[PDB]
Scaffold this active site. Structure first.
Site, PDB file in Angstrom:
ATOM      1  N   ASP A 151       0.931  -1.181   0.130  1.00 24.98           N
ATOM      2  CA  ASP A 151      -0.139  -0.122   0.153  1.00 24.98           C
ATOM      3  C   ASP A 151       0.815   1.183  -0.098  1.00 24.98           C
ATOM      4  OD1 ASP A 151      -2.265   1.536   0.276  1.00 24.98           O
ATOM      5  OD2 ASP A 151      -2.572   1.288   2.157  1.00 24.98           O
ATOM      6  N   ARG A 155       0.195   9.352   0.202  1.00 29.51           N
ATOM      7  CA  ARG A 155      -0.712   9.673   1.530  1.00 29.51           C
ATOM      8  C   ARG A 155      -0.430   8.690   2.870  1.00 29.51           C
ATOM      9  NH1 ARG A 155      -3.611   4.470   0.450  1.00 29.51           N
ATOM     10  NH2 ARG A 155      -3.474   4.386  -1.636  1.00 29.51           N
ATOM     11  N   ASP A 169       2.442   3.731   7.109  1.00 30.15           N
ATOM     12  CA  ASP A 169       1.522   3.165   7.215  1.00 30.15           C
ATOM     13  C   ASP A 169       1.105   1.553   6.936  1.00 30.15           C
ATOM     14  OD1 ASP A 169      -1.278   1.955   7.401  1.00 30.15           O
ATOM     15  OD2 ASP A 169      -2.146   3.902   6.813  1.00 30.15           O
TER      16      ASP A 169
END
Ligand SMILES: COc1cc2c(Nc3ccc(Sc4nccn4C)c(Cl)c3)c(C#N)cnc2cc1OCCCN(C)CCO
Length: 302
Positions: A151, A155, A169
């Site tokens: 991922d 962002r 993240d």
């Protein structure tokens, strides 16, 4: 009171709820609300540290809590200057606290957007190489420790006070010691615009697919966070990418950075650069500090 926090976190990640002071809200978070604040004596040789604090409230199922803790448990494994680090969790208390390194400038996406005129040049190639290099460093650590981020995107990176970029993240990252791949069985919610062709086709994720994502965030950096494949729908992006489609060179993009992208977007996964290779090709353009703090130039790396 006895809660999931008491069992699922090694008490070797624990810190007294008294040492942690919360100041103001930063924003919503996956499992609770995030606060800025200070954590006494959590960082070696610091009497005080600025940190981000997340609060899980009683009003969260034990399921919810357990998963949330396990996600953090993987963080624990990582100790890299370019991965946002977990500083510890407060487990004896009514709102579970997680203490993360503070990234004062937030997510790379938002940061990139803040550089635009007010509804379009990109950072200097040098600023850009630094970001690229610091992201590549974190990823190379990840891959060395046998994980696939899955991922990777603007962002999901944070920017520190001194503008350093870090991977941030990992709710979506998987272990790959043995197999060197993860295959998605059921429904996936990963954004299709960051997904490698092979990942769109088979649900296969490797470090080759991570490198593909990396290319896209280079593209995001270059365009100050435009939507990749603007003008196509998720439907069309799907088709377009699998059949060999490529993002167009940004207007105002220094050739070099777009050559780099074009290599990260080799269709044959095996033809893409490794994160180590990438770092090598630009390591001589990184601000001095890098050598000291990077995983590339560390003992762990060989
Ligand atoms: C904007 O919100 C922020 C979130 C942050 C953050 N997020 C975070 C995510 C998860 C957790 S816990 C967790 N949940 C799932 C997994 N884990 C570990 C924690 Cl404690 C923090 C971490 C971090 N890390 C580190 N720094 C952050 C800084 C933020 O803003 C300050 C400047 C913005 N700014 C005002 C810009 C200008 O307007």
């Amino acid at each position: 009171s006895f809660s999931a926090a008491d069992v699922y976190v090694p008490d070797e990640w624990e810190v007294a709820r008294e040492k942690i002071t919360m100041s103001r809200e930063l924003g919503q978070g996956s499992f609770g609300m995030v606060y800025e604040g200070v954590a006494k004596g959590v960082v070696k040789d610091e009497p005080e540290t600025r940190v981000a604090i997340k609060t899980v409230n009683e009003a969260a199922s034990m399921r919810e809590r357990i998963e949330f803790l396990n996600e953090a448990s993987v963080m624990k494994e990582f100790n890299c200057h370019h991965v946002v680090r977990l500083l510890g969790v407060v487990s004896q208390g009514q709102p579970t606290l997680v203490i993360m390194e503070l990234m004062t400038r937030g997510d790379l996406k938002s940061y990139l957007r803040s550089l635009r005129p007010e509804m379009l040049a990109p950072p200097s190639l040098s600023k850009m190489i630094q970001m690229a290099g610091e992201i590549a460093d974190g990823m190379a650590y990840l891959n060395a420790n046998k994980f696939v981020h899955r991922d990777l995107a603007a962002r999901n990176c944070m920017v520190a006070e001194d503008f350093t970029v870090k991977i941030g993240d990992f709710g979506m990252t998987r272990d790959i010691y043995e197999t060197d791949y993860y295959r998605k069985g059921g429904k996936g919610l990963l954004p299709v615009r960051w997904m490698s062709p092979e990942s769109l086709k088979d649900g296969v994720f490797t470090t080759y697919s991570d490198v593909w994502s990396f290319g896209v965030v280079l593209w995001e950096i270059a365009t100050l966070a435009e939507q990749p494949y603007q003008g196509l729908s998720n439907e069309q992006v799907l088709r377009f990418v699998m059949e060999g489609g490529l993002l167009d060179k940004p207007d105002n993009c220094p050739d070099m950075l777009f050559e780099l992208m074009r290599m990260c977007w080799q269709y044959n996964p095996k033809m893409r650069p490794s994160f180590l290779e990438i770092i090598s090709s630009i390591k001589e353009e990184m601000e001095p500090g890098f050598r000291e703090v990077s995983f590339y130039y560390s003992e762990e790396n060989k």
